[PDB]
Amino acid sequence: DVVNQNAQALNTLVKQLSSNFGAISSVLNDILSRLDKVEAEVQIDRLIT
Amino acid sequence: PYRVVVLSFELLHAPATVCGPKKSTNLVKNKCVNFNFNGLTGTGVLTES
């Protein structure tokens, strides 16, 4: 119940990478090459926060 | 009478079917390379599986 515990933490952290966080898409290269630079900064700022 | 064609496209929401319009490159294994596939991009070592 320690090891599992720590494992769950790491798993949950990596599962925050596939989350949109209110932006357009989780994968960052899409936002890097779909929109304009100010709009890209807005959506990337949502993902960074 | 003019044969007015109004051409439009849409990438950037889906994987693509009209591809290979130009030339590809060759395989490099066992090295940190930058791979570009049809839909998938990224950077990594392309070991043999």
Q: Is the Cα dihedral A32, A37, A40, A41 positive or negative?
A: positive
- Kindly report the nearest CA distance between residue A5 and chain B, in angstroms: 30
Q: Do B12 and A29 touch (CB under 8 A)?
A: no
Measure the CA–CA gap between A21 and B2, rounded to whole angstroms.
49
Residue A31, burial from CB neighbour count under 10 angstroms (0-12, 13-18, 19+): buried
Q: Do B41 and A30 touch (CB under 8 A)?
A: no
Q: Which of B12, B37, B40, B43 to mutate to test the interface with A (most CBs of A within 10 A)?
A: B12
Of residues B21, B43, B38, the one with CA closest to residue A28: B43
Phi, psi of B45 (to 5 degrees): -95, 125
- Which residues contact residue B47 at a Cβ distance below 8 angstroms, ignoring those fewer than 6 apart? B29, B30
Q: Do A30 and B12 touch (CB under 8 A)?
A: yes
Measure the CA–CA gap between A23 and B38, rounded to whole angstroms.
24
Of residues A30, A24, A17, A48, the one with CA closest to residue B42: A30
